[PDB]
């Protein structure tokens, strides 16, 4: 697709760093952040699609994402129903 | 056997 990883612009990463207590950000931090977020989303979505395909379903349900995050030790509350 | 993925083969 049209390079959608660039949809995470510098202001968004800067806000994320602000929330993380970061005081000043470097220039190359944004590329590293986009590459780490990409790697994390890759694993999460791979687990989600593995849970989906096994269910013969065409839609990635929220429970699939919850179970995927739970496998990675990133248990998420808010979508359990 | 002794035949696995190329990295191990």
């Amino acid at each position: 697709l049209r390079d959608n990883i660039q949809g995470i612009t510098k202001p968004a990463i800067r806000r994320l760093a602000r929330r993380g207590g970061v005081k000043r950000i470097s220039g190359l931090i944004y590329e590293e952040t986009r590459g780490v977020l990409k790697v994390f989303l890759e694993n999460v979505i791979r687990d989600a699609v593995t849970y989906t395909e096994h269910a013969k379903r065409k839609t990635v349900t929220a429970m699939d994402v919850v179970y995927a995050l739970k496998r990675q030790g990133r248990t998420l509350y808010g979508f359990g129903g | 056997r002794k035949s696995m993925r190329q990295s191990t083969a």
Binding site: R19, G20, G21, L69, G73, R74, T75, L76, Y77, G78, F79 | -
Partner: protein
Amino acid sequence: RAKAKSRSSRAGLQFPVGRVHRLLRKGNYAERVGAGAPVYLAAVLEYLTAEILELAGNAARDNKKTRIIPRHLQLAIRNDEELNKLLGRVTIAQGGVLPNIQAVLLPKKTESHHKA
């Protein structure tokens, strides 16, 4: 027959001992669940929920709000020493990390009289 009494009322718990034992017996966690396991599980769940709800209500009253929100739950979980240890891996939707105070900006630097 005699007036049926639930198991949550006997023990004195609010959470459902019946539904707990139900999830357990057909949850494959074991072969034949004991009669006391679900009671204890429901009691511990009720105690933990009561504690976290107390902390969330305290945080809400401190923030001058009536409806508990993910903000309050996150604050309560990360403020308590033991709940954070229990829920370190957990993340909450629409939550946030503990913030810092901006008052430090005032007695260091502000806009000067230049073209004020």
